[PDB]
Design an enzyme around this catalytic site. Structure first.
Site, PDB file in Angstrom:
ATOM      1  N   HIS A  11       5.967   7.108   6.144  1.00  0.00           N
ATOM      2  CA  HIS A  11       5.587   6.657   4.816  1.00  0.00           C
ATOM      3  C   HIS A  11       4.989   7.838   4.080  1.00  0.00           C
ATOM      4  CE1 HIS A  11       1.942   6.274   7.184  1.00  0.00           C
ATOM      5  NE2 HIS A  11       1.366   6.671   6.059  1.00  0.00           N
ATOM      6  N   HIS A  18       0.814  -1.223   0.000  1.00  0.00           N
ATOM      7  CA  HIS A  18       0.000   0.000   0.000  1.00  0.00           C
ATOM      8  C   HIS A  18       0.843   1.265   0.000  1.00  0.00           C
ATOM      9  CE1 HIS A  18      -2.559  -3.065   2.208  1.00  0.00           C
ATOM     10  NE2 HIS A  18      -3.290  -2.764   1.151  1.00  0.00           N
ATOM     11  N   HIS A  58       2.110   9.098   0.773  1.00  0.00           N
ATOM     12  CA  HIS A  58       1.034   8.889  -0.184  1.00  0.00           C
ATOM     13  C   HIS A  58       1.303   9.799  -1.365  1.00  0.00           C
ATOM     14  CE1 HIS A  58      -1.381   6.985   3.018  1.00  0.00           C
ATOM     15  NE2 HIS A  58      -0.684   7.833   3.753  1.00  0.00           N
ATOM     16  N   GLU A  99      -3.351  13.483   0.873  1.00  0.00           N
ATOM     17  CA  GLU A  99      -4.573  13.052   1.552  1.00  0.00           C
ATOM     18  C   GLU A  99      -5.302  14.260   2.132  1.00  0.00           C
ATOM     19  OE1 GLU A  99      -3.485   9.537   4.058  1.00  0.00           O
ATOM     20  OE2 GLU A  99      -4.348   8.557   2.300  1.00  0.00           O
ATOM     21  N   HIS A 126       3.839  11.138   6.132  1.00  0.00           N
ATOM     22  CA  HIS A 126       3.272  10.864   7.448  1.00  0.00           C
ATOM     23  C   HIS A 126       4.346  10.268   8.344  1.00  0.00           C
ATOM     24  CE1 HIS A 126      -0.999  10.610   5.670  1.00  0.00           C
ATOM     25  NE2 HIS A 126      -0.575  11.844   5.856  1.00  0.00           N
ATOM     26  N   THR A 133      -5.645   6.647   8.032  1.00  0.00           N
ATOM     27  CA  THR A 133      -6.218   6.864   6.711  1.00  0.00           C
ATOM     28  C   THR A 133      -6.270   5.603   5.869  1.00  0.00           C
ATOM     29  OG1 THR A 133      -4.187   7.568   5.582  1.00  0.00           O
ATOM     30  CG2 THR A 133      -5.504   9.293   6.751  1.00  0.00           C
ATOM     31  N   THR A 134      -5.875   4.460   6.423  1.00  0.00           N
ATOM     32  CA  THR A 134      -6.030   3.157   5.798  1.00  0.00           C
ATOM     33  C   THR A 134      -6.729   2.259   6.797  1.00  0.00           C
ATOM     34  OG1 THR A 134      -3.875   2.355   6.584  1.00  0.00           O
ATOM     35  CG2 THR A 134      -3.986   3.342   4.393  1.00  0.00           C
TER      36      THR A 134
HETATM   37  O1  LIG Z   1      -3.580   4.585   7.992  1.00  0.00           O
HETATM   38  C1  LIG Z   1      -2.715   4.938   8.765  1.00  0.00           C
HETATM   39  N1  LIG Z   1      -2.423   6.327   9.213  1.00  0.00           N
HETATM   40  S1  LIG Z   1      -1.103   6.206  10.121  1.00  0.00           S
HETATM   41  O2  LIG Z   1      -0.058   6.985   9.476  1.00  0.00           O
HETATM   42  O3  LIG Z   1      -1.339   6.691  11.478  1.00  0.00           O
HETATM   43  C2  LIG Z   1      -0.679   4.558  10.221  1.00  0.00           C
HETATM   44  C3  LIG Z   1       0.305   3.821  10.902  1.00  0.00           C
HETATM   45  C4  LIG Z   1       0.331   2.399  10.757  1.00  0.00           C
HETATM   46  N2  LIG Z   1       1.327   1.554  11.390  1.00  0.00           N
HETATM   47  C5  LIG Z   1       1.139   0.255  11.714  1.00  0.00           C
HETATM   48  C6  LIG Z   1       2.382  -0.218  12.304  1.00  0.00           C
HETATM   49  C7  LIG Z   1       2.686  -1.646  12.868  1.00  0.00           C
HETATM   50  C8  LIG Z   1       1.484  -2.588  12.771  1.00  0.00           C
HETATM   51  O4  LIG Z   1       0.282  -1.994  13.373  1.00  0.00           O
HETATM   52  C9  LIG Z   1      -0.913  -2.423  12.849  1.00  0.00           C
HETATM   53  O5  LIG Z   1      -1.271  -3.740  13.449  1.00  0.00           O
HETATM   54  C10 LIG Z   1      -2.243  -3.719  14.606  1.00  0.00           C
HETATM   55  C11 LIG Z   1      -1.561  -3.083  15.760  1.00  0.00           C
HETATM   56  O6  LIG Z   1      -0.224  -3.625  15.753  1.00  0.00           O
HETATM   57  C12 LIG Z   1      -3.535  -3.016  14.130  1.00  0.00           C
HETATM   58  O7  LIG Z   1      -4.289  -2.654  15.265  1.00  0.00           O
HETATM   59  C13 LIG Z   1      -3.289  -1.816  13.243  1.00  0.00           C
HETATM   60  O8  LIG Z   1      -3.756  -2.169  11.895  1.00  0.00           O
HETATM   61  C14 LIG Z   1      -1.950  -1.370  13.064  1.00  0.00           C
HETATM   62  O9  LIG Z   1      -2.012  -0.512  11.809  1.00  0.00           O
HETATM   63  N3  LIG Z   1       3.222   0.847  12.254  1.00  0.00           N
HETATM   64  N4  LIG Z   1       2.581   1.881  11.722  1.00  0.00           N
HETATM   65  C15 LIG Z   1      -0.644   1.717   9.965  1.00  0.00           C
HETATM   66  C16 LIG Z   1      -1.632   2.451   9.309  1.00  0.00           C
HETATM   67  C17 LIG Z   1      -1.655   3.846   9.445  1.00  0.00           C
HETATM   68 ZN   LIG Z   2      -0.375   7.741   5.813  1.00  0.00          ZN
END
Ligand SMILES: O=C1NS(=O)(=O)c2cc(-n3cc(CCO[C@H]4O[C@@H](CO)[C@@H](O)[C@H](O)[C@@H]4O)nn3)ccc21
Ligand SMILES: [Zn+2]
Ligand SMILES: [Zn+2]
Length: 258
Positions: free
Chosen positions: A92, A62, A94, A104, A117, A196-197
């Site tokens: 990361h 993604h 977008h 975004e 981000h 945002t995902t």
């Molecule tokens: O969409 C977003 N905006 S974000 O930039 O804040 C952002 C940051 C992250 N990250 C995820 C991780 C390590 C794995 O974590 C994932 O696994 C579980 C908890 O461990 C789940 O509860 C949850 O899916 C979580 O994502 N490191 N960063 C993912 C999406 C987004």
């Molecule tokens: Zn992001």
């Protein structure tokens, strides 16, 4: 796969598996600069990245994440709207298929070419997985990218992307200094929002910097050579991996500056 950015699994579909997609504090949003209110009680941001320890860069299908050692207070965000200490875990981006889209957040409906981000979690919750279950669990620093002059501090990222072209590939990525991705000014807008995902959890204090960074056309072109697919699968370019602006609902955006 059940979600992505394609015609059949993109943002307009995410609510079927993730009903919070239609929730009360979803991100991103449009930042209406005339409606945001200056809040003189907001403190300057404290970005303390001197001891940051980057480890690895990963194409997760993604985006690509540059991951940091978050087992100690090595790279932290404090101040601004935040109470307590938030540890940097990854950054990361977008980005778009064209320079006119990719961010975004938008600013008075303006889309930038990309958005960075920097993701941090509140140390009072112990780990990232617990932090995302809390309304103040994450603080994400958002930085807009426009196309113009090259960003020298980004080039080390650009140059490793060939080694992580496809989903699931990772590479060592040590000694990278995220301070080289910041603009000059730390003036910001802030509001409560979400990932945002998927899973779109409503756990983020968003801090969006007013000043964009400039990257070169060649730098962003290298982002657009990445793939959403895994190796040995049909090639689909990793472009337009952005969620559009969501309704602001019962939220106020505050500005750190006049
Ligand atoms: O969409 C977003 N905006 S974000 O930039 O804040 C952002 C940051 C992250 N990250 C995820 C991780 C390590 C794995 O974590 C994932 O696994 C579980 C908890 O461990 C789940 O509860 C949850 O899916 C979580 O994502 N490191 N960063 C993912 C999406 C987004
Ligand atoms: Zn992001
Ligand atoms: Zn899937």
């Amino acid at each position: 796969h059940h979600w992505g950015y394609g015609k059949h699994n993109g943002p307009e579909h995410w609510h079927k598996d993730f009903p919070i997609a239609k929730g009360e504090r979803q991100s991103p949003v449009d930042i209406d600069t005339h409606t945001a209110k200056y809040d003189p009680s907001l403190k300057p941001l404290s970005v303390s990245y001197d001891q940051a320890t980057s480890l690895r860069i990963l194409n997760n299908g993604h985006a690509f994440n540059v991951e940091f050692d978050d087992s100690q207070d090595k790279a932290v965000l404090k101040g601004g709207p935040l109470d307590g200490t938030y540890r940097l875990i990854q950054f990361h981006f977008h980005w778009g298929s064209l320079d006119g889209q990719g961010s975004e957040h938008t600013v008075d409906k303006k889309k930038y070419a990309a958005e960075l981000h920097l993701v941090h979690w509140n140390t009072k919750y112990g780990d990232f997985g617990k932090a995302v279950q809390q309304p103040d669990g994450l603080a994400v620093l958002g930085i807009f990218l426009k196309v113009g002059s090259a960003k020298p501090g980004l080039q080390k990222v650009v140059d490793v992307l060939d080694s992580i072209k496809t989903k699931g590939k990772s590479a060592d990525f040590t000694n990278f200094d995220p301070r080289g991705l910041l603009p000059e000014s730390l003036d910001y807008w802030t509001y409560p929002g979400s990932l945002t995902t998927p899973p779109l959890l409503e756990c983020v204090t968003w801090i969006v910097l007013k000043e964009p960074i400039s990257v070169s056309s060649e730098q962003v072109l290298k982002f657009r050579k990445l793939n959403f697919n895994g190796e040995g699968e049909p090639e689909e370019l990793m472009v337009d991996n952005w969620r559009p602006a969501q309704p602001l609902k019962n939220r106020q955006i505050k500005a750190s500056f006049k």
